[PDB]
Amino acid sequence: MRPPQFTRAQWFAIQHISLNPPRCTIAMRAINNYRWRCKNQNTFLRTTFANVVNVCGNQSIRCPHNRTLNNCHRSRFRVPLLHCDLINPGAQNISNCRYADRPGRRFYVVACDNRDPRDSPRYPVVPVHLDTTI
C-alpha cells in the first residue's frame, strides 16, 4: 500500500530509480518502513527519473502483467539494473531484513499516467508502475 504522502510517481522513484544504489540491505530500509512485511524482491533501474519519463512518451503497449491496461511503455535500450533479493523469507523479523545484491541488465516496461497535482508540473506524464523487465 503506497504511503498517502507520496504520489504514485514519487513512490515509483523511491522504489525503482537509482543511478548509484547503496547495498540492497541499506536501500530497502526506507521502502520496508511503510510495509507490514519485508519485500521479497525489488528492482532498481540504474537510470534517471528524466530518462524514464521519456520512455513514457513513446509507443504505447498493453501491459504484459495486466493486458487490460494499454498504457505501458518498453524502453528501447537494455538498462543496467540491481535486484535486491530477500534472504530471510517468512522468517527473520521484519525489522532487521537482509538482502542479497544481484546485478542485471534488461529492457524495462513501465506504466505511465498523468501526473498528480502535487507532482512537478515539469512532466505531464509520469511513470507510475514498473510492470516487468525483459
Q: 16, 65, 73, 83: which one is catalytic?
A: 16
C-alpha pair distances (Å), 17 with each of 53, 62, 88, 95, 110: 12, 22, 24, 23, 12
Check whether 40 is labelled as a binding-site residue.
yes
User: Who's near 28: CB < 8 A, 6+ residues apart?
Assistant: 38, 39, 42, 84, 97, 99
Active site residue 16: yes
Query: Hey, what domains does the chain have and what are their CATH numbers?
Result: 1-134 (3.10.130.10)
- Which one is catalytic: 65, 73, 83, 129? 129
Resolution of the determined structure in angstroms stands at 2.4
User: Binding site annotation covers 132?
Assistant: no
Query: Distances from the Cα of 50 to the Cαs of 16, 18, 56, 57, 106, in angstroms?
Result: 13, 12, 10, 11, 18
Is 42 within any annotated ligand binding site? Answer: yes
